[PDB]
């Protein structure tokens, strides 16, 4: 038992990590087949980016103006074009250490593993889970510019974010693969900020379902509720209201612990109107929305990955 | 910015988790240089362990008995031996991807990453620190025996942990890479528990001066406080006691700030008496102490590894 964030194994990832530096700017790369991928934000220079034009940019760039480092080997770049906000550098070298891989966009609500990057090198992994805003709350230093965040399913990678850049509430902001952001963020310097939040309740109720997994029961009761009545106390909260479908995604969870979703919402309401009372679950004073009903269910039952 | 529970990148580790099976027991086994390590308890039965004599039960064991999966390939065993509760299988076949490694013994109150690991395949990875008790607050499920723990310092792994059990709160134990448990358990069944913790004062101040790096200044205040002060508001709250090698491990955090360690422990102290009155500091509303002075400035500087 126990219950912990827990990131996917980085290796497959790691992998593919590489350094890209155009000029005097160095961030990191995505080395996959022969394609490398990372933010077109490495063609803007410090005047550019207010109102750069990346296409008059990329015009202006040869091959040779992007210097791709794998480790102590250094990848010959032999095309270069942009996808939304993307960059793909075409190498003449497949990396053979490709995984099998996938683009997929995440949904707000949804959790990915963080590879943390600079020049290339990998530094940490940590689970993030997309805002309802389309921010993540990561972990990002100067030169992490282009850190992927993924999922892993059987052997196949999923990749879902790129990273791009921090927020004035220290939020951090990305895209996915396909240089599309996650958000109304624009790789352009503005004073753009995140916007209102709410707190994902499906996320909560499954990770309630957790904690009695783990044997934390003290908020639990006998009461009920609707789904109409707790989606009304959801709204005084900040809570998202709450559907069948996340009623129906809960369902292996509920019948696994022999309570009910609507019983586990009722409990949820009294936590957000009486709060905790000096208490914790799963070692934590505060409600966690940031776990899905998958997460739980990998972690309280326990699938592995080749 | 951004401060996250965040592990060691998995790749080195990954490269070395096989699969060992006696009889009808299945465990994790670590494969460095023509060596695998794994916990002798493979070697047990069902009637076994209540005070198996693990001398008489290897003694009885051939290389045959031993049949070890690195993936989809399986290794010859050539040799056996057991140092303390770990088994050493020679196999015929030297790891090809063994990273530079030491096998290190940590203290409590430091911090390492474990690989969660069933059947040899990597599951999950994440940040746990060593309680004063000698537990760690884990998440394993059966199949997680021989899951190890590890640091990575430039491109050397440190290991220092390898799994064994679940105790009866749900706290996890273990074994060094030599075989020596952490702390006074045995790898018998008996009614052995974990026995009293204590919370890692250092650690907790280390985690507010990350707290004020990433602009959360709430708890800070004018007044200071006297080491002895400090340390008899600490036994009250079940806090260990501060040292003067606390204080100096925390000198560069405390330059960088510009908050003198004693101001810390002050506001501390305050947290302690008055809790945090509705408040959060990086996103706990629970003072936080699994998390070294190392860590804090790994994180809040930014080192890579290679
Ligand atoms: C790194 N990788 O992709 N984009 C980046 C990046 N670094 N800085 C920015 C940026 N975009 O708009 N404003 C900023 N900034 O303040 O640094 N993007
Ligand atoms: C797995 N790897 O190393 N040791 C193990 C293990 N599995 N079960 C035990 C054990 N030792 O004492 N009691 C138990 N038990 O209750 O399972 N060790």
Redesign the pocket.
């Known amino acids: 038992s126990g219950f912990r964030k827990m990131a996917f194994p980085s290796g497959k990832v790691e992998g593919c990590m590489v350094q890209v530096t155009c000029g005097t700017t160095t961030?990191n790369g995505l080395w996959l087949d022969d394609v490398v991928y990372?933010?077109?934000?490495?063609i803007?220079t410090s005047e550019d980016?207010l109102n750069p034009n990346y296409e008059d940019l990329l015009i202006r760039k040869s091959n040779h103006n992007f210097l791709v480092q794998a480790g102590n080997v250094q990848l010959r770049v032999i095309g270069h074009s942009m996808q939304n906000?993307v960059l793909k550098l075409k190498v003449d070298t497949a990396n053979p250490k490709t995984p099998k891989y996938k683009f997929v966009r995440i949904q707000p609500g949804q959790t990915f593993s963080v590879l943390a990057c600079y020049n290339g090198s990998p530094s940490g992994v940590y689970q993030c889970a997309m805002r309802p805003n389309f921010t993540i709350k990561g972990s990002f230093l100067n030169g992490?510019?282009?850190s992927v965040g993924f999922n892993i399913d059987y052997d196949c990678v999923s990749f879902c974010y790129?990273?791009?850049?921090?927020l004035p509430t220290g939020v951090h902001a990305?895209t996915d693969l396909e240089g599309n952001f996650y958000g109304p963020f624009?790789?352009?310097?503005?004073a753009?900020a995140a916007g209102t939040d709410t707190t994902i309740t499906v996320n909560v109720l499954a990770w309630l379902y957790a904690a009695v997994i783990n044997g934390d029961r003290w908020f639990l009761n006998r009461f009920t509720t609707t789904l109409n009545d707790f989606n009304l106390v959801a709204m005084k909260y900040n809570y998202e209201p709450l559907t069948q479908d996340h009623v129906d995604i809960l369902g292996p969870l509920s019948a696994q612990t022999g309570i009910a979703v609507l019983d586990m919402c009722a409990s949820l309401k009294e936590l957000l109107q009486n709060g905790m009372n000096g208490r914790t679950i799963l070692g934590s004073a505060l409600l966690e929305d940031e776990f899905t009903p998958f997460d739980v269910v990998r972690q309280c039952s326990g699938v592995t990955f080749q």
Chains 1, 2 share one sequence.
């Open positions: 961030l990372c933010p077109r934000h490495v803007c980016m906000c992490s510019c282009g790129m990273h791009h850049m921090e990305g624009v790789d352009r310097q503005t753009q």
